[PDB]
Design a binder for this molecule. Structure first.
Ligand SMILES: CCCCCCCCCCCCCCCCCC(=O)OC[C@H](COP(=O)([O-])OC[C@H](O)COP(=O)([O-])OC[C@H](COC(=O)CCCCCCCCCCCCCCCCC)OC(=O)CCCCCCCCCCCCCCCCC)OC(=O)CCCCCCCCCCCCCCCCC
Lengths: 171, 70
């Protein structure tokens, strides 16, 4: 068959979000609130293209919008967030329920200094509508022409010509 | 009298305290003063492998916060 078409190594270079998983999980609800739009454009492009190579640029927007999410935490509320992801980082299963006072301090400092509302129980699992200008992929499976089906039956059913025609049976 | 079983019960209780205390201190020593990361599900393992990749020292427990980004 054909050559697989991969992007080059310079096409994949982007400033990564070089933080740990507890830093991400501690900031997760405000990330799902504030970084909604490029993330949903990316995941819509990701389920519609069904090909990561056609989803790189939108993905870079994700990696553009996450970092600006953290710098805006780093410029204003670096220390309550630092205590909060440290307390999240202690636990094995990384429980939100073991760290409610640092969560309250972080949410209070964020709501005062930046004006972000933490999403409630039920909001981040909603299915939202996304306004994009990219075209809908007309063939995301790279399929081809389906074969022509067999012709159907039509016409009124006439009786059998001279019956069964089985050797001598005249009916 | 009856309280002479208490030395044997006490030594047995110490010998049962040793494994749990031991594995708790070993989990805190091998993981930078914290609990051992529990990965029952493949998402938890993916986050743990991501931590190992982003730590730079090939250890998942070395955490990098906002000081790693600009
Ligand atoms: C106002 C509204 C109302 C009006 C009503 C008007 C009518 C009133 C009466 C209505 C009731 C029906 C009466 C009979 C209608 C005519 C049927 C007929 O004769 O077909 C001729 C039929 C074909 O002849 P034809 O010259 O081509 O056409 C004449 C008709 O127009 C043939 O016409 P067809 O083209 O339409 O026929 C269709 C086709 C035409 O036939 C074919 O396409 C040829 C192939 C037929 C089958 C061949 C199989 C061969 C291998 C097995 C042989 C088995 C052993 C032979 C018999 C041993 C004895 C048990 O027949 C079949 O497919 C049916 C199979 C044969 C059964 C015939 C009816 C029997 C009814 C009474 C049963 C009594 C026992 C009969 C013998 C048992 C074995 C059949 O002849 C044969 O197949 C040879 C056997 C003789 C037929 C049966 C005789 C019936 C009278 C028997 C009285 C005596 C009984 C004694 C006691 C029992 C025996 C121990």
């Amino acid at each position: 068959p054909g050559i697989v078409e991969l992007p080059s190594l310079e096409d994949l270079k982007v400033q990564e979000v070089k933080v740990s998983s507890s830093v991400l999980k501690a900031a997760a609800h405000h990330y799902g609130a504030q970084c909604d739009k490029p993330n949903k454009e990316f995941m819509l492009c990701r389920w519609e293209e069904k090909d990561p190579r056609r989803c790189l640029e939108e993905g870079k927007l994700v990696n553009q919008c996450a970092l600006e999410f953290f710098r805006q935490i780093k410029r204003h509320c670096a220390e309550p967030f630092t205590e909060y992801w440290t307390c999240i980082d202690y636990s094995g299963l990384q429980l939100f329920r073991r760290c409610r006072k640092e969560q309250a301090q972080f949410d209070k400092c964020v709501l005062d200094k930046l004006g972000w509302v933490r999403p409630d129980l039920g909001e981040l699992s909603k299915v939202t509508k996304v306004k994009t200008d990219r075209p809908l992929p007309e063939n995301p499976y790279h399929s081809r022409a389906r074969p022509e089906p067999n012709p159907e039956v039509e016409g009124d059913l006439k009786p059998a010509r001279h019956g069964s025609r089985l050797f001598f049976w005249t009916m | 009298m009856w309280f002479e079983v208490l030395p044997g019960i006490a030594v047995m209780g110490v010998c049962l305290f040793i494994p749990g205390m031991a594995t708790a201190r070993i989990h805190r020593f091998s993981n930078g003063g914290r609990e051992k990361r529990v990965a029952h599900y493949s998402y938890q393992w993916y986050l743990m492998e991501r931590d190992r990749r982003v730590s730079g020292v090939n250890r998942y427990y070395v955490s990098k916060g906002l000081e790693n980004i600009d």
